[PDB]
Amino acid sequence: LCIEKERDALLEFKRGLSDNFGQLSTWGDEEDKKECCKWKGIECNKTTGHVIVLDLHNAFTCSASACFAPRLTGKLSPSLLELEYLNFLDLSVNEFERSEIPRFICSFKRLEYLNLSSSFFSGLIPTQFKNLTSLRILDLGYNNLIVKDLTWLSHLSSLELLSLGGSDFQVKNWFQEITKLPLLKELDLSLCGLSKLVPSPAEIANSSLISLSVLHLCCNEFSSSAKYSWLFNFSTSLTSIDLSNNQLDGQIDDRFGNLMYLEHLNLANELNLKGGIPSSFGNLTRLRYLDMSNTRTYQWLPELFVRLSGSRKTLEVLGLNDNSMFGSLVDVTRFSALKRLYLQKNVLNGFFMERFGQVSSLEYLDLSDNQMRGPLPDLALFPSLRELHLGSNHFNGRIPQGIGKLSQLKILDVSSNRLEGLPESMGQLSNLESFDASYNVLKGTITESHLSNLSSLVDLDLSFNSLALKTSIDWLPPFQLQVINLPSCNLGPSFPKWLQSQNNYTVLDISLANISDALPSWFSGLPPDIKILNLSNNQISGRVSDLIENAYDYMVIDLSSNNFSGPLPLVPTNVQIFYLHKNQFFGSISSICKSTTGATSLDLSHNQFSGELPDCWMNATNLAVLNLAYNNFSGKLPQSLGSLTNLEALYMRQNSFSGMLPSLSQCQSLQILDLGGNKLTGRIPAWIGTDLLNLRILSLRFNKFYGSISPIICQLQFLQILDLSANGLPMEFLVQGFYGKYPRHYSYLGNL
């Protein structure tokens, strides 16, 4: 069906642009690419072969704090005039030469859809746009163009949609010039500086009274009903109004309720919509989407539901999140088409009751970071939930045995509530990806039926609860979980057997469980990319020298408070905090820093360690918390300690250290330095008062320091504790990759 001149043209057009990522790879003069209409972004008329559709529009994907777009970064070539009959040209979200809109585009005379939005087209519209009389829909939004004369518009009578958002809009009288269009259903003027340009009552009188249906006015600095009052002249026939991000400080005009067909209203991210929706909202009848997020509307919730009762049956999405809305949540089931309701981060202090005797169709519900109390309702009434957010409240009771009826449920967050137990019926969810019921007051034993039939689980979080989790001995779980936080839960007297079967996890927190056997032999084949292993505070045994694997890019290893034994496991290469305290290790620590390590905090205290400290601490410069206290250590303090450019706390109490104290001049920043019971001798040196200006605790008790005291120690003046007996003379560190981009800050100062 393909026409020759058109491929030739399309190919020369491609020759200018640099696709770089593809998109235009399927374009060529090749025999294999010989029908141009089966190419990406071209569609041809079925009978006449002339191309009718060209869209190189590109969306963009957002990851983390950044979002990315494959922009075309090319030159836009006039050979396209040869296409002759295209009703659709879309070059959205592409960067060309960030230049004038090319005038040849106006020389088409058969266009109906021109979308150049969200590119970088700059300068100002060519007046030649008045020649494009055939244009039904124009989008030129979110470019860098200035708009001072709107004269051409009068000629495009055919328009039914015009976006001029994101302009240097400086036109005194758009009202006249925009009412000149007989069929404009939709207008976008967002970020056009509309507030500076206010339609006069007079200019509104000399106007065409168009039947306008959808309006976008976001990003205009209105702040009062005045600069947007012109809107209500289309009261006859409106459906959407987007007045989001307007610094709106005032009560909403009761006019909105009066509009008969309003079905979509976004007033989100305002300054102060004092109160909230008025009583005229009871007259709205059909409505579908309301958004007063981040408006500080202080309104009683069920009176809002009264004032939306005009639309029990039409309202689909209600977004009242991050506001000061008080009250209780009663009979949300009455809203039969409500699918999304977002009430998080309000001031609600009441019960989640629902007694209507009807069933809701809520798929997404968020009542987090409130003050709510009372028990949950029978969730069997809310079967369509895909994600149920309820954290940071004060709910109580057990979780209802009807939660087992939530099949489409993927996410459940009931953290930081005072709930008291789990039903077996949530061994039926099978789509529950992430289940977090941490910091509650749950009591009881969780059997394998509790977690039966839940194949799609990847996050389990039951932290700091009064709970127990014992499976049957020969139970095989249907789930492999990347995140496993089960602190303060007794998982079995025996090391939980079910973890032999999990091989995809990357963060293991089994701490404060009651466990007492030796480390099983199978557990050595622990997944190769674990970043957080917290086995501490148990009675686990085995010599972990050969029972842990090394350099797996650890991030947090805490093996403290156990009955582990042996010599120190050789420290993995990329770990940052490595805690071995409160165990039965012994031997040299001559292996610590033979290999380079970036650990920022290691704690080796309360062991049976011995020997002379190796002189390799420049192979671990990154330490800021060193804790060797409460071990039997004999030897000179290694001069390598001078190599700790940042060290915040140095714990050396209760060793048998002898000799003089080594040069610590270069470790200018430190806050804690105790060497108690260390049997160390020499004069108290000058650099404690001289280079170590930073300092808060200094303990040199029960040593052998000969010589007099320098008075210069009075020049620190932030030192809070000084103890130098029996001699004869707000702090923390960071783990960097913890939360992805964001570091984590850990506190280590404790008993003062």
């Binding site: 990851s63 704090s65 950044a66 990315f68 969200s118 991210n269 970036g598």
Partner: protein, 222 residues
């Protein structure tokens, strides 16, 4: 001296220049090696260099940053957050995607989880752009001879405000208190938030044989 470790750093008096390849394993088959050149009182000088190619090119790979440690002070009680920056940047071949940005954060408590994030991008290349829930700017602001477009979007719990320079700036200087206070008056950041971290570096998405040179990075909280 330049150093290639994933979470390596280098405390330097007033400023700490962290290198974070916090996203190295993005299947991006490459390496990055950062490093400090000069110290001169309030002004520092540093560089990095990298070659991240392929895998996930939708993603950031690293944020080598120049950071301030300061008396964490409430937004209300900052008179001036003066800063300046001068750099030039060198790359080769094709598919160079990356940005150059400041990154500030705020929380309720002096030691709290990041609640607000303020990015101020001096440069956007190859299609790199800030997280935006809309794809479109909430507003355009002008500060100290620079024109900025503001985007806002969610990074999990953090609310990320991002200013993008219309002029890709190779010589920035300004008072970031004007930016912080603009947000407090107009978009809705509480003045009670505590300013936590000030960082300035680059986020690369793809690139080959790249090297940034920072002639100076003076910065303060007074």
């Amino acid at each position: 001296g330049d150093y290639c470790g994933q979470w390596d750093w280098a405390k330097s008096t007033n400023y700490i220049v962290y290198n974070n390849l916090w996203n190295k394993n993005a299947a991006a088959s490459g390496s990055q090696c950062t490093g400090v050149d000069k110290i001169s009182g309030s002004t520092i000088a540093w560089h990095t260099s990298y070659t991240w190619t392929g895998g996930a090119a939708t993603e950031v790979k690293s944020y080598s940053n120049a950071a301030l440690v300061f008396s964490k002070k409430q937004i209300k009680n900052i008179k001036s957050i003066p800063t300046k920056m001068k750099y030039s940047y060198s790359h080769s071949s094709g598919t160079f995607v990356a940005d150059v940005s400041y990154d500030l954060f705020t929380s309720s408590t002096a030691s709290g989880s990041n609640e607000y994030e303020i990015m101020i991008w001096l440069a956007a290349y190859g299609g790199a752009g800030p997280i935006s829930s809309t794809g479109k700017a909430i507003a355009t602001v002008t500060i100290g001879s620079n024109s900025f477009k503001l985007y806002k979007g969610p990074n999990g719990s953090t609310t990320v405000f991002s200013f993008v320079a219309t002029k890709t700036i190779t010589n920035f200087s300004a008072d970031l208190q004007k930016f912080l206070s603009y947000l407090t008056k107009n978009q809705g950041l509480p003045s009670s938030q505590y300013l936590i971290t000030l960082e300035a570096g680059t986020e690369p998405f793809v690139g080959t044989n790249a090297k940034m040179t920072v002639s100076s990075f003076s910065a303060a909280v007074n």
